[PDB]
Structure 1
Amino acid sequence: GPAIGIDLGTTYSCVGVWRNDTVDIVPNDQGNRTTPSYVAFTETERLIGDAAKNQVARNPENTVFDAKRLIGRKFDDQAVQSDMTHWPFKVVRGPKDKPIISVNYLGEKKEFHAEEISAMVLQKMKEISEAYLGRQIKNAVVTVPAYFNDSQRQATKDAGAIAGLNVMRIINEPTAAAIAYGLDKKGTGERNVLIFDLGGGTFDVSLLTIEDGIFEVKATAGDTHLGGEDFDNRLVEFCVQDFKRKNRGMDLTTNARALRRLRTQCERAKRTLSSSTQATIELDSLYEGIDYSVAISRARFEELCADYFRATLAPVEKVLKDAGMDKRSVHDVVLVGGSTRIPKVQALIQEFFNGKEPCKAINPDEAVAYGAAVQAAILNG
């Protein structure tokens, strides 16, 4: 039957399908083409995607996310132990050193492996595709980070099987993005491709070489805790200090609701500032019946996050340095990840590459799913 490509992302997931001999990226029921990689369990239901993410504050112990940071890893891994201190859900050690997520669900304690959480997300991507295409779907390519090891790959395949998918192949995220732009069929001889992938919570840079249409991952670098959320945090912080300055030292972070509402509008302000030079936050009855409003300029946003945005160019230097390649030798710079929409981030990268135009014609948070789907179709016939 038909085959699909799924980007199983750390914070968002995305699915591509084949209609009329081209690739369609599938909207979810919110009209969005990316679905949060969130699941939640209550006494009467389980929620996936936006619904799960939206109720996190009301049910934080049973709202699971970041499963991609556990999948295929061991419980006493240092990264795992570090991440566990920032998650409100419980993780305990299963037999054979396997992490187990423990939550409450339908009135009982329930245990899940990370691949079981990821299977739910994959099942959602499968369902929305089935509605979109009007048929049952089994065959899929699923993407993973280039640095994922054999155990992380197999656990991703298992998440596939658990969701009822026949995973024809697990391919690398940066390669899928390269495939989406046809880069393996563009020009003569050897082609050097840099993938710059800045998301909600992770940053990955990958340097690939293509020859005779064959992909080799030459070098990877990045930061697994830099992305869009950190930029949101900086906007929040600014607003908190502005509010004190206006209201005799009153701190808004003391109230939870005021923070959620503020964090919600900061995210929206950040998005708005990718296409406008000004954004407004205005929230009635924010803290102590105190109303709050502020005008935030793009320049101010760029200023609050200046260190972060400069820090994204260091992994670009590391992959090039590690591969013994000059930045001049890169033929395609590909922007992937929703945070690449930030004009300043695009300007920094373009400046680093001496004014070269990036490949950005495909939505950067859809490029991976797109390439996955091309590959699914090739493997499918």
Structure 2
Amino acid sequence: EVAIGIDLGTTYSCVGICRNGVVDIIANDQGNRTTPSYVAFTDTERLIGDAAKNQASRNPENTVFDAKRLIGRKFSETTVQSDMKHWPFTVKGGSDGKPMIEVSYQGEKKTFHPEEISSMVLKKMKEVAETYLGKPVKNAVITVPAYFNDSQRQATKDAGAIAGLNVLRIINEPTAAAIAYGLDKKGKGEQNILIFDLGGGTFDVSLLTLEDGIFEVKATSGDTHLGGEDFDNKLVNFCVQDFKKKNGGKDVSKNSKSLRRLRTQCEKAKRVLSSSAQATIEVDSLFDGIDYNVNITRAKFEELCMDQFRNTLIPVEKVLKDAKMDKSQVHEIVLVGGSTRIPKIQQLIKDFFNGKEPCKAINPDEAVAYGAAVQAAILSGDQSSA
């Protein structure tokens, strides 16, 4: 009976349920409405979500994340060779050509396929819904990026099966976001929908057409390496240089633990800057027992990220060009992904679309799970959302 919608995200995952036409996004044990797509292995336990992300800087080698960049891929693909520089954990190729993530768990060397790591994230999201409902959950709709190939979709479905879920369907993330806003029901006639999805690691723009309750992905573009983590890195690079000017050329970047601790505080300041004009980045005993403190204005953050923010419009122009349509022909602009909370990004998109207000009523990092939950309820025979 009970079916959930799961956004299996690169950096964060989210679980929703649609009952009586109402969608509840379910909070985890820590009260978080999204859960990090992190899995860590220690001498005693296997941590998933918040607990895994929280100990990442203390256990870099055995804390896995970014499995979505490896799922359904051959280890030899150029994408894997390029991305692996960003991972403190070890990834090797198996005799079947599949990636094998190598960690230490309880003093033993263990290997996992990307779909096994993703199955642990999915199992945690299943448990988050189960704790809320007080009942077991078997059915689910899981989302994937529109550009995911058959191998990536099938490996994501397999991750669901391993997690104990009966995957009703694998659907596209941009389509799930459009379904969340009821754009398939609302009004009538052909509608051109632009989904602007800027998450923690990726940027995806998708141009959809909707005629008679049927969504079609006309064109997609973006950048698989542009997200919130790149804006955090702009703050990290600035702080590293600021520390040098304050402490006679001392270089924080030589210590990877100092960088990780600084990155944690840079991301917190970035979030504050979405609703405040200023924020403080503070790390006690950052490097060589030296305390670090700096005040960052929203203007300074905007300046450090200026080119990256403006360049988000390039894939918007590209999808419009590929779909052979003018920006004036876009009926709805849906903001998806946690980074769309950045005021400058919202302003740039609004100005590009000549003052058109983007649809952002749903928490952008929840809209995909919200749409997947609606689709899960429809596929279970519940027509109340319509």
Q: Distance in 2 between matches of 1:338 and 1:267?
A: 12
1:245 aligned partner: 245
Q: Distance in 2 between matches of 1:369 and 1:21?
A: 15
- How much has 1:190 moved relative to structure 2? 0.2
Q: How does 1:31-50 map to 2 (within 5 A)?
A: 31-50=31-50
Q: How does 1:38-117 map to 2 (within 5 A)?
A: 38-117=38-117
Question: Does structure 1 residue 261 correspond to structure 2 residue 261?
Answer: yes
2:293 aligned partner: 293
Q: How does 1:187-206 map to 2 (within 5 A)?
A: 187-206=187-206
Equivalent residue of 2:137, what SS? coil
Q: Distance in 1 between matches of 2:324 and 2:187?
A: 23
Q: Distance in 2 between matches of 1:291 and 1:89?
A: 29
1:355 aligned partner: 355
Give the alignment's TM-score, normalised by structure 2. 0.96
- How much has 1:195 moved relative to structure 2? 0.2
1:223 aligned partner: 223
- How much has 1:241 moved relative to structure 2? 1.5
Q: How does 1:10-21 map to 2 (within 5 A)?
A: 10-21=10-21
- How much has 1:282 moved relative to structure 2? 2.9
- Residues 81, 252 of structure 1: alpha-carbon distance in 2 compared, 3 angstrom cutoff: closer
- How much has 1:32 moved relative to structure 2? 1.1
- How much has 1:206 moved relative to structure 2? 0.2
Q: What one-letter code is carried by the residue in structure 2 that aligns with 1:69? A: R
Q: Distance in 1 between matches of 2:241 and 2:375?
A: 49
Q: How does 1:137-286 map to 2 (within 5 A)?
A: 137-286=137-286
Q: Distance in 2 between matches of 1:111 and 1:293?
A: 40
2:131 aligned partner: 131
Q: What one-letter code is carried by the residue in structure 2 that aligns with 1:355? A: G
Q: What is the root-mean-square deviation of aligned Cα atoms in Å?
A: 1.3
Q: Distance in 2 between matches of 1:364 and 1:215?
A: 20
Contact 2:196–2:206 under 8 Å retained in 1: yes
Contact 1:2–1:18 under 8 Å retained in 2: no
Equivalent residue of 1:57, what SS? coil
1:339 aligned partner: 339
- How much has 1:189 moved relative to structure 2? 0.9
- How much has 1:286 moved relative to structure 2? 3.0
Q: Which moved more, 1:217-226 or 1:82-91?
A: 82-91
Equivalent residue of 1:285, what SS? strand
1:376 aligned partner: 376
Q: What one-letter code is carried by the residue in structure 1 that aligns with 2:176? A: A
Contact 1:192–1:329 under 8 Å retained in 2: yes
Contact 2:204–2:221 under 8 Å retained in 1: yes
Q: What one-letter code is carried by the residue in structure 2 that aligns with 1:272? A: V
Q: Distance in 2 between matches of 1:285 and 1:214?
A: 56
Q: Distance in 1 between matches of 2:19 and 2:188?
A: 30
Equivalent residue of 2:96, what SS? helix
Deviation readout 1:25-54 (Å, 9 max, x if unpaired): 011122111111110112221111111112
Equivalent residue of 1:128, what SS? helix
Q: What one-letter code is carried by the residue in structure 1 that aligns with 2:267? A: E
Deviation readout 1:60-84 (Å, 9 max, x if unpaired): 2221111111111111111112212
Deviation readout 1:65-114 (Å, 9 max, x if unpaired): 11111111111111112212322222222233222212222232222111
Q: What one-letter code is carried by the residue in structure 2 that aligns with 1:101? A: I
Equivalent residue of 2:184, what SS? helix
- How much has 1:136 moved relative to structure 2? 0.5
Q: Distance in 2 between matches of 1:329 and 1:218?
A: 14
Equivalent residue of 1:183, what SS? coil
Q: Distance in 2 between matches of 1:285 and 1:71?
A: 38
Contact 1:195–1:336 under 8 Å retained in 2: yes
* Runs of 5+ consecutive residues of structure 1 not aligned to the other structure: none
Q: Distance in 1 between matches of 2:293 and 2:59?
A: 29
- How much has 1:257 moved relative to structure 2? 4.3
2:384 aligned partner: none
Q: What one-letter code is carried by the residue in structure 1 that aligns with 2:75? A: F
Aligned length: 381
Equivalent residue of 1:56, what SS? coil
Q: Distance in 2 between matches of 1:97 and 1:291?
A: 47
Deviation readout 1:321-359 (Å, 9 max, x if unpaired): 001010010000000000000000000000000000000
Give the alignment's TM-score, normalised by structure 1. 0.97
Q: Distance in 2 between matches of 1:307 and 1:67?
A: 28
Equivalent residue of 1:174, what SS? helix
- How much has 1:20 moved relative to structure 2? 4.9
